[PDB]
Amino acid sequence: GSAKRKRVAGDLPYGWEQETDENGQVFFVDHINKRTTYLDPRLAFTVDDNPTKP
Structure with a gap:
């Protein structure tokens, strides 16, 4: 479904x-670098952990 009740799942x-x-x-x-994109940013943008990696 649309799941239009709770904005929690772990999508982006x-x-x-x-x-x-x-x-x-x-x-x-x-909201880190602040760029609005009309395309899905999950394609080649796989999150590798979540550390203070520069």
């Missing part, structure tokens, strides 16, 4: 927020 990487635009197109925006 840490930092990324799931929002929707005025066209009803879903988009993701990271």
Whole structure:
């Protein structure tokens, strides 16, 4: 289903927020570097742990 009751599952990487635009197109925006992207950032962007890695 749409799961439109709780925004918790573990979909996007840490930092990324799931929002929707005025066209009803879903988009993701990271709040670390602060980039809004209308594409899914899980393709080649696999999270390797979550340490202080530069």
